[PDB]
Structures are given as structure tokens and as C-alpha cells.
Amino acid sequence: RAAVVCGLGSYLPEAVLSNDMLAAELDTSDAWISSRTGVRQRHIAGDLGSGDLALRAASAALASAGLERVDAVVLATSTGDFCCPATAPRVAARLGLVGALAFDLSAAATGFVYGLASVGSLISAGLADSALLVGVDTFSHTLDPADRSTRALFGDGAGAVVLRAGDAEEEGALLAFDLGSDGHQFDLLMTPAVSRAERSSGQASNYFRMDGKAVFGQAVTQMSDSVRRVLDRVGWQASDLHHLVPHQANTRILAAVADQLDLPVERVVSNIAEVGNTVAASIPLALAHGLRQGILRDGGNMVLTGFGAGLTWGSVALRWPKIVP
Template sequence: MVTPAAVVCGIGGHVPERVVTNDELSSMLDTSDEWIRTRTGIRTRHVVEPGGSTGDLAVRASEAALRSCGRRAVDAVVLATSTPDRPCPATAPEVASRLGLNAAVAFDVAAVCAGFVYALATTSSMITSGIVDSALVVGADTFSTILAPTDRTTRAIFGDGAGALVLRKGQREERGVLGEFDLGSDGTGVDLITVPAGGSRQRSTGSAPDETETYFTMQGKPVFVEAVKRMSGSVTAVAARQGWGVADVDQFAVHQANARILAAMAENLGVPVERFARNIERVGNTVAASIPLALRDAVDGGSLSAGDRVVLSGFGGGLAWGSVGLVWPDLTPAESEENRAEGIPR
């Protein structure tokens, strides 16, 4: 019996209409355009308007992904996010319902910036085991809603957005097959990337948290070191499992956390930084949406083409990391209807 494979067949993305520039942040915080650009590589980021949510962005990106491959329905919706619309229930079932997929399998995956790769691994297993024949894998986050208003570091880095891939059952010799995965975690670093309050540990104390504990915090220097080390090792492992050398990889779609991390990874791996998909200047760190948005923009910009060897890699809170390899299929990205109407550049 031939084991089926999970094949990428559609791609889409969406970012909110509102753009926040470095100059706008500088008018509210003790920072500057130069300070932000030289430390992060970011010039602008998109943020949701009041009342907007992760689910809203996920629906728009999913619609675009389905439209790119001419599909109206899939069997499952797997949403990677750390900013769900509500603490309970998961956001994916409502996203599926809004897409008209009321009977679909639907659930969230929480692995922060590694979430999209974890969601791909989970969904790939569902397809290869015969549980479903097709699925939407969505990465969406609205980190603007959990950042401290006066924290110039986190507010400079993060933006909101969503990206999605459509997967279908196929054969292993096809382009677009999700190949070898590498996943890992290190819970000793749990406090490096966190929102301290709001979970059962804090709530069980019966005490109201300090306001600062309700916002996202990150220890930049150790996170930088861990991100470069873990993603470089994971990328190398996946390339080897695919039967490739690192130098054989045409494009690295790595989590867009910081331009310096991309440069450090390129140096670590001994490959040109130009092989790294990059849209961080325009959208910032969009967390679980980062990898699919970078893929969409790489295809649209012509740096990623059918037949290219690609490795996706993410690193985030937990600590958690993961990578996967594939040969890129022939895809035409679709913008969300809102982004097309507003003329928002990719």
C-alpha cells in the first residue's frame, strides 16, 4: 500500500489596513526610526483596528488561500496562534464556520512563533494517516493587543497578520510534498518569552496580577542566541534528512523575528543572506503568520519558484522550534479581497 503525502496546493495572506510607521511610534515612545531600523530592520508594521481580532485575519487569509487553488472547502482548519479571540474556546472552529466549513475538523495549535511549523506537522500527519484528505493550515496573530503601551522594544518589533497554506492528499513524487520535519522544545526557557498572567498558575493564587504581568515580555539577548542556534541546527537537520546539503537549499523561509537573526543564521549556515525570504521591513514580526506571509511574498516577488528546494523554520516561546523541507510547487498567491481593494502592498 502506497502511503499518501500532504501536498501544498494553495497560499494566501492578509494584513490589517492600518500601517504604523517608525516615525509614528517615535512620536509616542522614547525611540526613533534609526534606532528601530538599525536594531531590527523594521520600518513599518500593520495593526488591527479596535474590535479586530485574530479570527478576522485568519478568515481573510484562508479565503485568499482557497481562492488561489480554486477550492471552496477542505476537511480541516488548523490555526496556529498565541492570541486567540477568547481564552476558551479555540478560535479555529469559528474561523471554519465563517468559511462555511461547519463540519470540518478545527482546532488551535499554540507554539508561538514556531506554531505554523507545528501546525503543518500535525496536519501532515492527519492527511498521511487518512483522517482527512485536505486542510487549511493558518498562522495568525494580533500581538498588538498584548503589548505594553509604553514598551518601545516590543511595540517596535511586532505586527499583526495572517497567512495560510492549503494542503491536499497526494503522492510523494509530487512537488509541494511536505517532507522531513524536525521539531523540538526546551521548557527551561519558558520565562524568556511569556505573558506571565492570565493562566491557571496565576489565577489559582486568587490575587489580581500587576498590570505589567498581563503584557507580553521577552528577554532579547538570550532569545537572539537561542533563536540562531536552534533554527540553524533544525535547518541543518532537515536538509540532511531530505538528502540535501545546506548549500543545496534555494530558499530559507525562516521566522521573521529580526533582521539580525536572519543575517546571523546565514553566517552560521555558510549561505548567502539573499537566500532568506525577507519581508520583516514591511510587516515586522507577525509571530505564527510570519512564515506563510514570507512565503507568499517570496513567490509574489519572484525569489521563490516552482522546483526550488525550500526549508521552513520557526522558533518561539516555550521554547519551541521546528523546520520542514519541501520542493516548492507551482502556486499563484492570492491577496485577501480587503488588501486588494485597499491597495496594500505586499
């Protein structure tokens, strides 16, 4: 009993932050923003929360799958609408799926990969026959207004897939996983929790921070090595890969991952220039981009891979199924 991908959907908020806007706001330049990140625009949730974005992505994903019900709704997010409860139950209800198994999973930029492991396993174990997994984050709400580095990189969005029970020989079946963590380096990427004083005031200044230099080099190796492990597990060489869909960490990181694997860079699916780094949403948003562009091959050998806060990392191998755009 396998878990099979059978639907894809996504949603990006309407508002866009350009380099020109960001340069004007923070008294910097267009050059600096592109140079450092290669990101030219990022979508900004504004008054919308992760729940709102997830709802739109999930509805589109259900239409894609040709299904009007699923047994489970899981959100991979670090930017839930509340501290308590999870966002997933509300999203499930707003999809007309009251009664569904629903919860949020926290694994930062590796959330979508961990999400696939969790939902895929629920289906394989017989606790659900179908599921929505939504990778969604609204990191823009959590950025320091004065910080040009993070504001240049991060954007908001949601991407969703539908999984169903199936056979391991079907296109879209999740074939092998690599999953890990290194909590010894937990402090490298962080958005602190609100203090009790901040909760009392009704104002928090708990902003996302990252050690950019320390994150770059490690991110490349972490994802490259994780891909290699899953390639070895499924019996593929790097050359057998048609599609590599990494967490869109930064512009340089994506090509650097290909370099380590001696994989042609053109095989890396990337839209980081148009949407920025959307954390848990990055992989399914990149998938949606590939599908829009007709890049994704029916039955093509594919690996999805992530690395992020925790630290966390992981990869999943599958053959890409026929998905309705």
C-alpha cells in the same frame, strides 16, 4: 500518502505603525527603531482579532488552491479571540466550512511549522483529505504600550496554506520534519495568563515580555541547527537550498542564520522590514512576499524554519509547488 501544499493566501490589517509614529508616541527616535530591529513598519489589527485576519487569509488560500471545501481548519496562534473556545471553529464556520475538524495549536513563533506537522500528519493518517492551516497572531494587542523594544519589533497578520492528500514525489509534499522544545527555558519569552483578580476587574495588564539578548544568540543557533538536521535527513547540502524561509524573528537573525549555514543571504526570504515580527504568521507572510516578488522557483528546494516561546523550534523541507498568486 503525503501532505501536499496546493494553496497560499494572506491578510495584513490596514493600519500601519511607522517608526515616526512610534518615536513620537514613546519619545524615542527613528534611528533606534531601525538600528535595533531593521523593522520600518508593522500592521496593527486594532479592532480586528486573530479570527478576523485568519478568515481573510483562509478565503484567499482557498481561491489560490481552486478548492471551495476542505476537511479541516487549524489555526496556529497564541492570540486566540477567546480563552475558550478555540478560534478555529468560528473561522471554519465563517468560511462556509461548518462541520470541519477545527482546533487551535499553540507553539508560539514555531506555530506554523508545528501546524504543518499536525495538519500534514492528519492528512497522511487518513483523518482528512484536505486542510487549511492558518498561522495568525495579533501580538500588538498584548504589548506593553510603554515598551519601545517590543512595539518596534512586533506586528500583526495572518498567512494560510491549503494542504491536500498526494504522493511524496509531487512538488509541495512535506518531505522531512525536525521538531523540538526546551521547557527548561520556558520563562525567556512570555505573555502571562490573566489573574483571577484581573478577570474580575475586566482589565488585564498581562503583557508580552522577552529577554532580547538571551533570545538573539540562541534563536540563530536553534534555527540554523534545525535546518541542518532536516538537510541531513532529506540529503541536501546547504548549497542545494534555493529558499530558506525562517520565522522573521529580527533583521539580524535572518542573515545570521544564513551565515551559520554558509548559505547566500539572498536565498533567505524576508519581509520583516515591511511587516515586522508577526509570530505564527511570519513564515506564510514571507512566502506570500516571495510569491508576489516572483522569488519562489517552481520545484525549488525549500526549508521553513522556526524558533520561539516554549522554548520551541522546528523545520520542514519541501520542494516548492506551482502556486497561483
